[PDB]
């Protein structure tokens, strides 16, 4: 589907910046 964005959005699904996690890309 979405290269890197997939891992990104994987991070977005965790809450994005709200997760506290640092975005994959």
User: Is 23 in contact with 8 (CB distance < 8 Å)?
Assistant: yes
Task: Read off the DSSP letter of residue 8.
Answer: H
Tokens representing residue 12 in the block: 């977005």
Q: Please name the residue that has the structure tokens 């996690």.
A: 21
Q: How many Cβ atoms are within 10 Å of 2's Cβ, its own excluded?
A: 9
This entry's atomic model was obtained through NMR
Q: Alpha-carbon distance 1 to 19, whole Å?
A: 23
CA 5 to chain centre: 7
Measured in residues, the chain has a length of 25
Number of separate domains in the chain: 1
Domain that holds residue 16: 1-25
């Amino acid at each position: 589907e979405e290269e890197c964005v997939r891992l990104y959005i994987q991070w977005l699904k965790d809450g994005g910046p709200s997760s506290g996690r640092p975005p994959p890309c």
